[PDB]
Write a protein that binds this ligand. Sequence first.
Ligand SMILES: [K+]
Ligand SMILES: [Mg+2]
Ligand SMILES: [Mg+2]
Ligand SMILES: [Mg+2]
Ligand SMILES: [Mg+2]
Length: 170
Amino acid sequence: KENPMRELRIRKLCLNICVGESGDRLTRAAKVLEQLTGQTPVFSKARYTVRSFGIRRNEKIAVHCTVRGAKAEEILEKGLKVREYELRKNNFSDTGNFGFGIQEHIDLGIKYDPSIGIYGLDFYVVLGRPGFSIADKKRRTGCIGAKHRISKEEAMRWFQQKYDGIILPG
RNA sequence: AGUUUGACUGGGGCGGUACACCUGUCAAACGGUAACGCAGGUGUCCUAAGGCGAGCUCAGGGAGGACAGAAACCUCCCGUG
Ligand SMILES: [K+]
Ligand SMILES: [Mg+2]
Ligand SMILES: [Mg+2]
Ligand SMILES: [Mg+2]
Ligand SMILES: [Mg+2]
């Protein structure tokens, strides 16, 4: 009934880890993303100086990576397994894309190394349909259109159908 | 001993600089147009903040995401500036 070009699918998984300050902590956090994603992470500087958070401007504060393709799908199932395939409905967003956070990186895949820290990580998957790339395109870029957009309700079905997930009322 | 001891100025002095400049206004829809008219600014700064090319999009807001809270970072959407 539905067109094959309307099928929902994962655009990117967008792992992010934010630490307080630049230092060995950030470098070891970068290795944490590198081992999980098999991919070189990128550091993010602080936009402003905040004395309360003890961060200075243009200081490396966080490390983040974007994972696409089958690699993203395999990372998502590990993280969902940490949350026992149970996502709260507030986590799903109005734009049609959801995210969850994992407190401990060590539990899934990677053995703890004494050099490596105890860092957790942040998941935010972006859900898309075929043809969403027209917005990114340089030539003749355009908006996707209302019917082709993904709603919060559609994302919730996708989790409930693909991962037999449970959306708790929270 | 010789000489000098600025100017403008609702008298002079004191105070200010309207004494060389720049923006808006006055200013009466070309331009020009005065008051010690009004609101301000200048004696600098920059091997890049100069010159090309390329690639991006900004302020702000909404919705999401471990520690994270009104603000740390990540993601999507709106966004004529
Ligand atoms: K005029
Ligand atoms: Mg005189
Ligand atoms: Mg005239
Ligand atoms: Mg005129
Ligand atoms: Mg250009």
